[PDB]
Each structure stands twice: as C-alpha cells, then as structure tokens.
Amino acid sequence: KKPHRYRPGTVALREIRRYQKSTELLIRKLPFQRLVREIAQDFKTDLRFQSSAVMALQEASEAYLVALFEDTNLCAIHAKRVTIMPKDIQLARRIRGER
Amino acid sequence: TRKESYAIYVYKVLKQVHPDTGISSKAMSIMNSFVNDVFERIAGEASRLAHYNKRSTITSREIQTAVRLLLPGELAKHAVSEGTKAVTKYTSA
Amino acid sequence: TRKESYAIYVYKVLKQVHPDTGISSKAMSIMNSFVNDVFERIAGEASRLAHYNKRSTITSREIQTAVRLLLPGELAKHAVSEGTKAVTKYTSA
Amino acid sequence: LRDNIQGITKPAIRRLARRGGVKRISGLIYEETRGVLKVFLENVIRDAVTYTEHAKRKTVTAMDVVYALKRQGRTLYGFGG
Amino acid sequence: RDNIQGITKPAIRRLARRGGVKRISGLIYEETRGVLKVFLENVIRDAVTYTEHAKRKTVTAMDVVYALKRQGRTLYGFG
Amino acid sequence: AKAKTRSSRAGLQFPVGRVHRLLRKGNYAERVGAGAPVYLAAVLEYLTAEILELAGNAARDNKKTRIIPRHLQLAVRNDEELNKLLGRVTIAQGGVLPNIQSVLLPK
Amino acid sequence: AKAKTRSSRAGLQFPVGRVHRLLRKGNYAERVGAGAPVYLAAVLEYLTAEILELAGNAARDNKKTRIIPRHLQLAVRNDEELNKLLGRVTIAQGGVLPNIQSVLLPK
DNA sequence: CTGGAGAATCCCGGTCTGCAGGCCGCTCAATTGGTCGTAGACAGCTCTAGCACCGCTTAAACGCACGTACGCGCTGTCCCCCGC
Numbered sequence: 213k214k215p216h217r218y219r220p221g222t223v224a225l226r227e228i229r230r231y232q233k234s235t236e237l238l239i240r241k242l243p244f245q246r247l248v249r250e251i252a253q254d255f256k257t258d259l260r261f262q263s264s265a266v267m268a269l270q271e272a273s274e275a276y277l278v279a280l281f282e283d284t285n286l287c288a289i290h291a292k293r294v295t296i297m298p299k300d301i302q303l304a305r306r307i308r309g310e311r
Numbered sequence: 312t313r314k315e316s317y318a319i320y321v322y323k324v325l326k327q328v329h330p331d332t333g334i335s336s337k338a339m340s341i342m343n344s345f346v347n348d349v350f351e352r353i354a355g356e357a358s359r360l361a362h363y364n365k366r367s368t369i370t371s372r373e374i375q376t377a378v379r380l381l382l383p384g385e386l387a388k389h390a391v392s393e394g395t396k397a398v399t400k401y402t403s404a
Numbered sequence: 405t406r407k408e409s410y411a412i413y414v415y416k417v418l419k420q421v422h423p424d425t426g427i428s429s430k431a432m433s434i435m436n437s438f439v440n441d442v443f444e445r446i447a448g449e450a451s452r453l454a455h456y457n458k459r460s461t462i463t464s465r466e467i468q469t470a471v472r473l474l475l476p477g478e479l480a481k482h483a484v485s486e487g488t489k490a491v492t493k494y495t496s497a
Numbered sequence: 498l499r500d501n502i503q504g505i506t507k508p509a510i511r512r513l514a515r516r517g518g519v520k521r522i523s524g525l526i527y528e529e530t531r532g533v534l535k536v537f538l539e540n541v542i543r544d545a546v547t548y549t550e551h552a553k554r555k556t557v558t559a560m561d562v563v564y565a566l567k568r569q570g571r572t573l574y575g576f577g578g
Numbered sequence: 579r580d581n582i583q584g585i586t587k588p589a590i591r592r593l594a595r596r597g598g599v600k601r602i603s604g605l606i607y608e609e610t611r612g613v614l615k616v617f618l619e620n621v622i623r624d625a626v627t628y629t630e631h632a633k634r635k636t637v638t639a640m641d642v643v644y645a646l647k648r649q650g651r652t653l654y655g656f657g
Numbered sequence: 658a659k660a661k662t663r664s665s666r667a668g669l670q671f672p673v674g675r676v677h678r679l680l681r682k683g684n685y686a687e688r689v690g691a692g693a694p695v696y697l698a699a700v701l702e703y704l705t706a707e708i709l710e711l712a713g714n715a716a717r718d719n720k721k722t723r724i725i726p727r728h729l730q731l732a733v734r735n736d737e738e739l740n741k742l743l744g745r746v747t748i749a750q751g752g753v754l755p756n757i758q759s760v761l762l763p764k
Numbered sequence: 765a766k767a768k769t770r771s772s773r774a775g776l777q778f779p780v781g782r783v784h785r786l787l788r789k790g791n792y793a794e795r796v797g798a799g800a801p802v803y804l805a806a807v808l809e810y811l812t813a814e815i816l817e818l819a820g821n822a823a824r825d826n827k828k829t830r831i832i833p834r835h836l837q838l839a840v841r842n843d844e845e846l847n848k849l850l851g852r853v854t855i856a857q858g859g860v861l862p863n864i865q866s867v868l869l870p871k
Numbered sequence: 872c873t874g875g876a877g878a879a880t881c882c883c884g885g886t887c888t889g890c891a892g893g894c895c896g897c898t899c900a901a902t903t904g905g906t907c908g909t910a911g912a913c914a915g916c917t918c919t920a921g922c923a924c925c926g927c928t929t930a931a932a933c934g935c936a937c938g939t940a941c942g943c944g945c946t947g948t949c950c951c952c953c954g955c
Contacts, residue, residue: 216877220953222763224520226879231516235727235752238512243504250498251538252557255546260556268562268576269541274513275747276537276571277530281517289760295521295952296514298529305533309851315782323777324812325831329820333830337655338819341833341855344654345815346808348853350786353804356568358684358792363564364552369787370797374804376551380544380568386814386845390807397806398799401774406899408675415892416670417705418724422713426723426891430575434729434748435708437578439701441746443679446697449648451685451791456644457632460910462680463690467697469631473624473648476738479707483700490699491692494667516753520761524952566747575726575749586932596860600868601941636921646854655833655856660902674901684791688910723891 237270244270280304317346353377371398409436446470464491502531541565582611621645664698671698671705711736726750770802778805778812818843833857 231238245266252259280301287300305311321342325334356377361369371394378390414435418427449470450462459466468487472480510527544565549557560577567573587607594602624645629637639656646653663673677694711732712724719728730751733739770780784801818839819831826835837858840846 232755247501264559368795371799371803393810394803437574464692464696487696
C-alpha cells in the first residue's frame, strides 16, 4: 500500500531521452500564431500570413531556444549546479553577443 | 599611380561639425575603411533586394529598404529623413 | 508557371550511392536548399576574388580558390580533386 | 490581440528545456524565456515585414521569413530554399 | 623554433589585465598559447590562399584584411 | 552532329548548362569562364554524394528505406567537417543529437 | 553651360558622381536609378557627420585638437546604436573602454 | 547484496493510406555553328621593400624568496521544485 512514486530526477532524465529523439514541434500552434500576429500588428496592420511562414517562425524559434537552453545548461554546470538560473541565461546571451 | 579616397569629403564634414578640430592620418584611414564597409554592405543588400523582386534596376527605394534593414532604429529613421530630403532637393533643383 | 530545382540530379546521385534508398519530399527540398546555399557561397566568394584581382572572368581557378577558402580540410581536398578531374575529362572530350 | 505571450505555457518551456538537456529548472525562468523569445520574434518579424512591404504585398510569405533569417545569420533549410 | 614560448607570461598577464582579469592560474598560459596558435592557423591559411591566388610570393596586408573579413572579424585602419 | 550535354561530356549528373546560365544571371561577373561551371557542378555533385551517403547510412541504421530530415540532421551533426560547414544552418524537423551531460546522470 | 556638381544640386558634400560610377562598376544590378547615388551619398554623409561629431566631442574631452583612433573607439563603443552597428568591427589601436567588475574592487 | 512489484518500454502481427516514383506530352532552354571584339597571357623593364647582418643599450623577462587568502572540501539547514 504505497504510492510507488519515482525519485526526483529520473522522470526528468526519461523525458530528456524522449524529447532528444523526437523532431516534432513542442509548442501549441494556435497560441504561437496568435502571438506572432500580435507582434506583427505593431509593424503594419491588416497583415496576412502564409501558413508556411508561421511554421518557419515556429521552427526557427524552437531551434534557437533549444540551442540557448543547451548553452545555459553548460553555464549552470560550470557553476557546479544542477538547476538552471536566469543569470546563466543572461551570461550565455552576453557571451553569444546578443547582449 | 593615383588612388582615390574620401579624405577631402570627411575633412569637409568634420569642418562643418567641428570647424576647429584636427585629425590624424590613422583616424581618416579608419574613416575611409568604415565608409567603404558601409557602402559595400548597403550596395550588396540593395542588389540582393533587386534580384529578389526580379528587377534589373537599383532605385532609391531599394536603398531606403536596405538602410531600414541595416540600421537600428533612430539611426535608420534619421538616415531615411536625410536621404528623402536630399532626393527631393536634387529633383526639385 | 514552372519552377526548376535539382531534384532529378539529387535522385540520380542517391541511386548512384544508395540504389535501394528512397527519399521524402521534405528531405528532398532540404537538399535543394543546401545546394542553393552552397552555390551562393561559392559564387559570392569567386566574385569577390575576381573583383579583388581586377578581372573580368570567373574561371575554374577562382572556383578552386573559393572551394579551398570555404571548405574544411579533407572536404576541400577531395572537392578540388573532383573538380580537377571533371575539368580534365571535359577538356579532353 | 493582447496577452498572447502567456500562451507559451510552462509545460512547453519545460519540454523545450528537456530537449535542451536540462534536468532541473527554476520557477523564475519562464518569464525570462518569454521575454527573450519575444525579442527574437520581434527582430525577425521586423525584417520580414520590411521585405514584404518593399514588395508592395499584403501577405507575408515563408520565403520572406527565409530571407529575414538568412540576414540575421540563422540559415534555415526546408522552407522553399 | 619554440616561438610559441616567445609569448612570455608577462605579455599574457598584460593582455589579461587589459581584459580586466585580476587573478590568474598558472595553467592559463599554455591554454592561451594553444588558442592563439589555433587562431593564427585559421587566419594565416586563408591569407596564404589569397596570396597564392594572386600568384604572388609576398603576403600583403590586404590579404590579411580579406581573411579577417571573411572570418567575421572586420579590421579597419589598414585599407 | 547531335547535341551532347556538357554534363555527359564531363561525366557529371548535374546540369552544367543550367549552372552556366545561373552564373551569368547572378551578376557575379561580366563574363563567365568556360570551365568554371563544370568545376562548380563537380563540386556540388561530390558534396551531394557525401551527404547522401551519410544520410543513407543513417537511415539504414534506423532501418528505413527513405531518408527523412532526422537522418539528414544526424548525418550532418555526426560528421565533424559537415557540421563545421553547416555550423550556422537550421534543419527543419531535424531534431537534436541525443547527448546528455554526465553530471546529471543518476549516481 | 557651366558644369554643376550633382552634390551641389542635392546640397551634399559626398561625391554623387563617384558613388554612381562605383555603383555601376560594382556588379550589383544591370541598371542604376538616377536617384540612387544621391540617396547613398546622403546616408553616408549623415553617418559620417554623426560619428565625427561624437569623436570630436571625445577629443575635446581629452583636451586634444585632433581626433585619434582612441577617440573613435570611445565614441563608437559609447554610442549604443553605433556600437551595435560596428559589433564585429575591430579598430586598430582603439583600446578598450575602461571597465572593471564590481566584485574585483577592494572591499 | 537480491528477489518481487509495478511501471515503462519493445516488439511483433495486422490493417490502412498518402505520396514516391514512375509514365507521358510538350516546350523552351540547352546545344551547335559561326562572328567578332577585346581581356589577359606573356615577355620585358624598373626600383621598393623585404630580407639579412651587425653593434649598443637597456627595459623586460626570469628566478626566487616569502607570505596569505582563496578555492575547495566538508557540514548543516531549509525551501522549492518535482512526481503525481
């Protein structure tokens, strides 16, 4: 009569393995399209969009985010830590040249 | 032979903004390098744009778009204003 | 209208090296884009080489130089060998 | 169109980090991720709209996105070429 | 022949100081030597390529300028 | 005599004539040399052969008869020189290399 | 009639004729618009004036009558938009901005 | 060490289906042949700078003594992120 729960972290490793083998998008399509159109609203009104364009933005953004996450993980590990801190992201972006 | 540069024009611009400030040779060499760099960047972007729209002519609109793409914010706005004013003045003249 | 691509030649090469291997449309487009990008890189580098040397022609020597500049090590050497072999064969025949 | 950046839910960023090889994640990360993503999207969309307008068009094509990504040093294959 | 040892530790320390570095480990110097060597190969290879394509035997500064430019490191003040 | 394609003359799979046309239409120079398009076509063909060979090896390793973007990404990233060449390229639906840092492994 | 410079007609200091000639010989497009070199020269002149003003300010702050590469570097790095524009540009003998991290300061 | 237990994953048939690839008609872009103009290949000339050498001079690198603070290991606390 025990809940039989897994230890903290093994599930994280399992999902890391799961998501490092797949290739599909990880973000819901409709919210991403809504955000993209909202951002584009500030540059020109009544703008129409090809669907292939929105897929292109989604792919590029997810790839860039994965790269940034990988760099941030290295930065945090350099601090002998296991959890990711925003300071790691800031340092990584600064080193990349984005800051 | 003779090699052309931007020394005289940069000198005149300097005398317009700072009518008393001198300049060294290394500085104006850097000036000419910077001018050439910007020229090549804008011209290449304009050529890319013209090829993008299947057109054989490079007009001032292409340069305006290229400047908007290459310069950040306020610099782009001010440069657009300068180019528009110069074009209008030359056409009127 | 009609758009052209490198699809047939890519499929030919695929059958040459892996005669029993198919390919999806998306991957096929990926190779098409890759070939286009490499074409642009080599062409731009060759154009810069010609302009630097004040030349009117893009010859195979410029192509070889651009290949050396843009390719890493063994890729560059093998590509140079392949290009020289193809040029020799075409010249002879 | 207001309050869409909240559309990127915490599980989505979690999945993104898991694909990024991240095992333990702080709770005060997600808003930073959203801000950075917003900056990147703004930077790309600005140039994409510039390209679309220079062509005197009213719809944004994927090919415009391709040019915008290329000019920012992030080349993407498989979207027209 | 060990010109890589021509890069003495005072010069490395000076460069670190201009870089705003206060405390330096002893293992740093050889690491800098290696990284600088790698950078030098990367630049010089392209420089020699340009010199050869021009069918010349003397490397010009403009060759170095082009090599740096094509590597994403633009340099001014030399042409 | 009957027309003989320059690709066949040089024994290549890629269209040398189309390459020459693109070279002339790219505003790259005033005039285009005779052998340059052949050289470029040969180089493109060789690189295509390299990437296709690696992708086919990967797809067979995954035990599929068609090459998908995942196999392309695996082939490009696993090769040192190909990854070096395509260092700044994003492959749609390419996924990531299954790499995990050692420190996060359960000990 | 007497020759009048196109720069004077546009009220510019940058040589519009030289710009147009370089555009023609730069292999950018088959045809060049008449209003193109004027626009390009105007943009170049504006940017030159901006950075020259900043460099003159820096040189005056150093009580020097001539702008040196150090002044140019200081002006470029201090101006946010200018620094972003020349992000990957290295200036010879420009030095670096004097900046020291807080944690290294004595406490 | 070490069986059980439970959850997670793999695998092997069995079924369906969209597209990969082959086939076909056509057409326009590649080809062939001939003209002509001119870019650069080539030989030749000049003289600049790049290489080498030598002798002083002295600032900088080097070696070393010495001392201290900091990177690192260790420990206890709590809170906050993960598994559900």
